[PDB]
Symmetry: D2
């Protein structure tokens, strides 16, 4: 008897999920969708031969009782609203970043969940399910390299749309690191600070590319995170964790080596879609399996999403001040941990 | 409406499949099993909370009509018998290597299939579904390195059981290469030959380890294939294809690099189970999806399995003669291709 | 007819040079030494079967006319004095870092050289002669990766003496980067800034280890330079230059790969002495050959050394202020370039 | 007081040596040359401002007493004659491969040396002085990977001259491996055998390219050695030694990594001249230093050269017979070891 899932946001990424759940994963089906382009959602449903209802809005869909869990995978700002609803409707919710565009927005969502007694919110920070990132977790948890001291890492795009704005860097993009980093080291972010290098020819003038973001944790770990979205050569995520006694570092994507025309190369991906495809599959399957066999979700908590929002805040603050902004994080509710 | 699958052979590897199909893959369920330790099969069924019938034998199970496809995943020699049956019962069959322990055995199976009009037999040579091996396929199909000329490759075990016999090398072990190699280059094996290096201390005396196997194709491609199952350091599969104008080579398994105590290392797997887990998942999902949306299976053909058997023959022949045995392959039936 | 060289400073490093010049290089001999442990100097002349005079001081030695060039390779602070002398004595001088312990000290040395009409001072920043660092230079000079934007690099020791002080990091250690970096990118250092991560267990408490040093150039290039001298695992120099369209990165020292006990490793050096041995050989040979066939020295200029001193200043300033210190560099005299 | 060296053979390679000795190495000078294009030799003495005599032949030059050691670096076949002479003239001789074009030719040279009481012959197999090959030696000598069992290695040219003949492969080319391999493992070659893969488009029809050469040692070690001189992509030497418990493998030449246009590459050399430049320098310096401080040469012995010749024989034999030729090696004279 499978888990019945409603998808709010029949967009590109919601479509990818509907697809994996329908044709790749196990133990769940899509019985309900609503888009804001109601027609788009109706086209999706035929596209993937679903047996699902098409609601005009989230309320209508959250109403429905043959649906016990929802994907919030719509336009970013409309997330918060949909989530709080689903929490009160006492259905399970998986929410693609952002959790809520604003920190307080996130906060409201936390408070709701602490009421409804259990863990219904999982945030879609898939990096935690990537095999490389997991091996990193595993190593640290094993003390392999002793006390973590600094972290060097980079997040690079070949290019971006004209739509890409100097803040999206720390908002849309650096957000995954912001989650995964503290996840790994199990520390909280004390301060952030931003430094702008010589703007790049491959970037449009209304955009500050690259950027560097230094971040300190409570413990004393220092992170420098390159973000460069017009690097032209490829899409490439890099993370090296220097420890007291050793260094561990994230792998490249698997690739066949080539010897030709003077060079000994491996392949670099050009399409962010490819880098994490398996992390998504694992992430979602975990939502499912986790629910059916535990009555609560498991991955990145509602809290973890708040931590993101605050920190993104401190970042855009530092973006404008070029000054060492503080990151004021609220009490971590006993509820969590 | 999902595909209903019967498993003949509730052993370790049949269990792994029952597990992935039940808890990992999409669009299929297990509705029928039979082991030869009838009790084992009954224990499996409870283990994985199945809703399946437990038959005393394959016949009983092939009888059943709520089953439209079967996994032959039992003890190696009992494969052939189960398969021919399932072909006449006009159900779909996925068969873990071997197809049939003897070449002619394979031949009977081919002839049956050519009668029953379509493609119901898929052989479990999962390497073809490994991402690395696929990139290799892709490159060649693209002529990247021009005409393939030689192949160097190795198949290494940390150790083996006391049960491991000097022929199992070319029978149980080198079989995957034997499939994947010709698959890649799209050529047939002309001759084989075996050379025994200085026997290894890590090997028991009743066993000849390592061994080298040279193989020529019709076209003129030369392959040398190390096989060494007591290499002590790990489990490691390596394949490099030298071409007219370039070289491509299989990747290592993804791994975090480490800098510690004087060395800059990556991880090597110790457990053959891990190396290919994802190839299995993909392989089986392909059986399923392929069936439901095409009315025929897709992967390694019944023919491809025969090719294996013949070639394993020529190998054990060369094993005893240390002489350049010929590989006499029969007409490839138009049926295939 | 070979170049006749006087060595002031018959210490460990001066000895290494006397050795390479006598038994490794071409076209020069040692005809004069002076130490401050006058006896230590006698012992050497014996050690290496020299045919050289032993002066009581630099003046005595600079007096001598059968000597046309000198190595200043004595205790750090005693450098300045010896060099100014040799400039007025109109002999050629190769000076191991530091040029002068203080910036002004360096300045006096520049002014002297601009008088004496030509180039007699070469500073021993050997990194510029390392084959890897040279390939980097070459690439950039060829625009391979377009406009350089950021640089990530690290300088790591296994451990240090009790003698090692929190400033030595930027004074003795980071100095090589400080030279090579701007050498490479052909830009001047605008600001520096220092950030102290969580002090390391492997470091004595009177010492701040690791440290991070951010540096901006006039042009807009940003550098973050890890310095960590108690990293325990090895001695390791790393440098990655991110450009507009590409990334180039310094190589590891050549090493045989090993597959054993679960890991696939390369070697890491433990002994800073080994990392650059060939850069020294090249560096010195270039002093020699450059002199005999050009009447002037070639490598890192007296100026380049001053640039170091100022920048080391700004660093120790930032060390104490944890504030973004400015680096005020004087006019670059036409003399140079 | 330096070593006085006569060069017989003022050709391209003899010139390279004259150059390194004059302008790179330590403790030796060139005081005597003879070519067969007597004029070519005059031009050289000028080219390199030597202070040397120009003899009309080797006899004239071996006569001379201000010369205590000679480079035999002339046309291949003329080697033997020049060497036997120099042995009787009781001068030291360094001889670039071949030692003698024929095995017996080598034999005569051995017998002469055993008479004249000591070691005066060093054969120019520079691979033994390459830093990578040395690390390999070192590892094995340390048992790191236990008993060596198989060796995979390859010797690849981008292309060759029209002058290149199907035997030159095993005669001019594979000769370095033939020396270094047995050097490393300290075993003698029992049999050889040759296998011709599908001839390559990049090769002229009068030439069989690639070739594979299998070789067994007395002990039981098996080697397969690819030789492919029209591989188009670069010049590349590769050697992997599989052992009882581990695998060690020769490094790539040092190179800066690049990230650009979708690929993550290192450089591959195109010019055999570059691959070993430092091994030559070391090799020759060792001849010098070894002589002056030991009264005998050190590197690859006259014997080692004979071993080459015999084995080259067995190879060209196998080249024509495509049959497993034997390698009949004579008693190793106590003289050696
Ligand atoms: N391209 C990228 O790199 C990444 C994109 N994403 C995420 O995907 C989400 C949106 O982008 P895409 O799905 O790729 O394209 P998209 O912008 O087309 O998705 C937004 C969709 O949801 C919308 N929507 C918002 N609230 C709704 C509501 N209450 N009811 C119905 N529809 C609603 C629209 O219907 C729209 O089609 C965002 O969370 C974004 O951050 C995820 C990872 C990275
Ligand atoms: N360990 C290894 O490296 C590999 C093992 N395998 C394959 O797995 C198969 C068997 O090994 P495992 O499953 O791992 O262990 P296993 O030997 O326990 O599996 C054999 C099972 O099927 C048997 N059997 C044979 N014919 C039967 C029939 N008609 N009805 C009921 N039962 C029958 C037994 O019941 C037995 O439990 C073979 O095909 C083997 O080649 C696959 C890849 C590699
Ligand atoms: N550029 C480089 O790669 C490099 C490398 C090593 C050292 N150095 C610098 O050079 C210095 C020397 O290092 P070392 O390893 O020889 O140390 P060491 O302890 O082995 O000896 C230093 C020597 O210099 C002598 N000395 C001091 N002042 C002198 C003077 N005015 N005249 C003649 N001799 C004098 C001492 O008697 C001593 O023998 C250090 O301070 C160091 O910072 C630079
Ligand atoms: N061991 C190595 O790494 C190595 C490297 C290069 C060449 N070699 C061998 O050495 C040989 C020389 O190569 P090269 O590059 O100088 O060729 P090259 O064409 O540039 O010149 C060969 C020279 O040897 C001279 N010569 C021939 N016989 C002579 C004799 N009896 N006495 C004096 N001079 C004589 C010729 O006049 C000519 O100048 C080749 O046959 C080659 O196989 C060995
Ligand atoms: O968060 C993400 C997106 O915003 C961004 O567009 C992708 O390029 C990133 O790699 C992904 O992690
Ligand atoms: O075929 C196989 C098994 O027989 C063998 O036992 C495994 O070690 C191999 O790697 C696998 O490919
Ligand atoms: O000059 C230096 C030393 O003082 C220091 O000890 C080493 O770490 C540096 O590598 C070297 O370049
Ligand atoms: O002696 C040799 C040459 O004849 C040949 O051309 C090169 O391929 C080899 O690398 C070199 O060792």
């Amino acid at each position: 008897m499978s888990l019945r899932i409603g998808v709010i946001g029949t967009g590109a990424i919601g479509k990818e999920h509907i697809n994996r759940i329908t044709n790749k994963l196990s133990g769940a089906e899509i019985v309900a969708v609503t888009d804001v382009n109601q027609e788009a959602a109706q086209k999706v449903v035929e596209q993937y031969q679903l047996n699902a209802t098409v609601y005009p809005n989230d309320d209508s869909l959250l109403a429905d009782e043959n649906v016990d869990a929802v994907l919030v995978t719509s336009w970013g700002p409309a997330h918060e609203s949909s989530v709080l609803k689903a929490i009160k409707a006492q259905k399970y919710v998986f929410c693609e970043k952002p959790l809520a565009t604003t920190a307080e927005g996130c906060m409201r969502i936390v408070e709701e969940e602490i009421k409804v007694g259990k863990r219904l919110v999982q945030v879609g920070f898939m990096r935690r399910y990537d095999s490389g990132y997991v091996q990193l977790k595993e190593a640290l948890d094993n003390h392999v390299i002793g006390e973590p001291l600094m972290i060097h890492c980079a997040h690079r795009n070949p290019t971006v749309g004209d739509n890409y704005t100097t803040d999206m860097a720390v908002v849309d993009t650096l957000v995954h690191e912001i989650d995964v980093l503290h996840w790994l080291v199990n520390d909280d972010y004390e301060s952030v600070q931003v430094i702008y290098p010589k703007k790049s020819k491959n970037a449009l003038p209304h955009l500050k590319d690259p950027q560097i973001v230094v971040i300190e944790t409570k413990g004393g770990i220092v992170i420098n995170a390159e973000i460069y979205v017009n690097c032209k050569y490829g899409y490439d995520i890099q993370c090296e964790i220097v420890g007291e006694d050793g260094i561990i570092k994230l792998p490249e994507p698997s690739s066949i080596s080539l010897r030709k025309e003077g060079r000994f190369s491996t392949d670099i991906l050009m399409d962010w879609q490819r880098r994490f495809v398996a992390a998504y599959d694992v992430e979602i399957q975990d939502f499912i399996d986790s629910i059916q066999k535990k009555g609560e979700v498991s991955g990145p908590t509602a809290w973890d999403g708040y931590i993101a929002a605050v920190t993104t805040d401190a970042c855009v603050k530092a973006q404008e001040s070029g000054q060492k902004e503080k990151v004021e994080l609220k009490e971590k509710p006993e509820f969590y941990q």
